[PDB]
Design a protein around this ligand. Structure first.
Ligand code: 88Y
Length: 108
């Protein structure tokens, strides 16, 4: 539905909001695979995803429904959980952002 995709745009807008910026910032833009320590990122992560790409996919109507938009948000989180150590700061940040996402996505 067209109405449920406007709600997806609204969930993504909240994720980009100042309220969640302290922990959402690592998810804003694609992972810089040229940064120190990330030489192996592309070897472990087959399908990278970030909030700016999801936003472009929405604007370009690349999602048939809320399920497809949801899949890419969760892909972005699963990439973070798969790649990093479970005790890493970015994993806790992903968990805080995903709490915002799952609560909003569930209530639509
Ligand atoms: C490895 C990993 O999981 C990462 C790394 C970044 C990241 C770090 C610094 C500046 C921008 C970024 N995008 N973001 C995630 C989700």
């Amino acid at each position: 539905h067209m109405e449920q995709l406007k709600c997806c745009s609204g969930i993504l807008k909240e994720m980009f909001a100042k309220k969640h910026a302290a922990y959402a910032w690592p998810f804003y833009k694609p992972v810089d695979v040229e940064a120190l320590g990330l030489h192996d990122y592309c070897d472990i992560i087959k399908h990278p995803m970030d909030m700016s790409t999801i936003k472009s996919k929405l604007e370009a109507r690349e999602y048939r429904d809320a399920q497809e938009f949801g899949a890419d948000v969760r892909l972005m989180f699963s990439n973070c959980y798969k790649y990093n150590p479970p005790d890493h700061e970015v994993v806790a940040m992903a968990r805080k952002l995903q709490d915002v996402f799952e609560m909003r996505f569930a209530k639509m």
